[PDB]
Amino acid sequence: SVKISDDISITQLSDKVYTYVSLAEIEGMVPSNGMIVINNHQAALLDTPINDAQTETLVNWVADSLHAKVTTFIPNHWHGDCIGGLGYLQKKGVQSYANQMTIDLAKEKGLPVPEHGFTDSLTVSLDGMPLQCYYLGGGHATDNIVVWLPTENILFGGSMLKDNQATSIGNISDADVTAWPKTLDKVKAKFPSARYVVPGHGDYGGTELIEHTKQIVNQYIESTSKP
Ligand code: NA
Ligand SMILES: [Zn+2]
């Protein structure tokens, strides 16, 4: 990882794909992940840190160090660790795509609202490079999606995925706990070729994050059913 300003670090997974960790103070210095996909000096930002400040720092480093202008943006769901810095991106003129469900939640909450909304699946062409978005059911959040990079065999599962060292289900304020393990089933069955699998918070890895996360959630269901 390459550490930079604002408690942010970036780790390269391939020539055109990067994965960043932006530490942020909550109520707890919480770590948040996203991606930086590049093609023809144009970048796609998958999720933003929790705010406009950290986002600007990340977007500038990409321009400065990665020689690429962020032109595209796709959030996992409506939570701040996804669109907290969308306000600044919109000032920069960044085009955005998100599950129609995310657009509506952000809308009814007076939060920044992404422009184009898809309902099933959508593929954005980063000037040639395909960023495939997929809504496979509720999970960590009702509206959560996954972004698959076919050309690089990389999946940014978002916060619906936990890293291998994770042990708790986490914030289920807007989660659909019962459908979470079903969505994880769909994700595993849809992307078995995943080289890398990046979660919402924590260390990336491979497809095992999917099964482990399913194990964590299912144990949660088990733990709150019993008498
Ligand atoms: Na994020
Ligand atoms: Zn979330």
Residue with tokens 């952000």: 106
Q: Do the beta carbons of residue 106 and residue 85 sit within 8 Å?
A: no
Distance CA 74, CA 48 (A): 9
Q: Resolution of this entry in Å?
A: 2.7
Ligand nearest to the CA of 143: 2
C-alpha 186 to ligand 2 mean position (Å)? 19
Cα–Cα separations (whole angstroms), residue 222 to 170, 217, 226: 15, 9, 7
Closest CA to 147 of 206, 179, 191: 191
C-alpha 40 to ligand 2 mean position (Å)? 31
Q: 4 φ, ψ to 5°?
A: -135, -170
Q: Is 204 helix (H, G, I), strand (E, B) or coil?
A: coil
Domains of the chain: 1-227 (3.60.15.10)
Residue with tokens 């699998």: 197
Pairing of strands 116-118, 17-25: unpaired
End-to-end CA distance of the chain, in Å? 46
Closest CA to 79 of 52, 106, 99, 101: 106
Q: Is 49 helix (H, G, I), strand (E, B) or coil?
A: coil
C-alpha 159 to ligand 2 mean position (Å)? 6
User: Which residues does 60 contact at the CB level (< 8 Å), separation at least 6?
Assistant: none
Sign for the CA dihedral angle at 120, 85, 191, 105 comes to negative
C-alpha 222 to ligand 1 mean position (Å)? 29
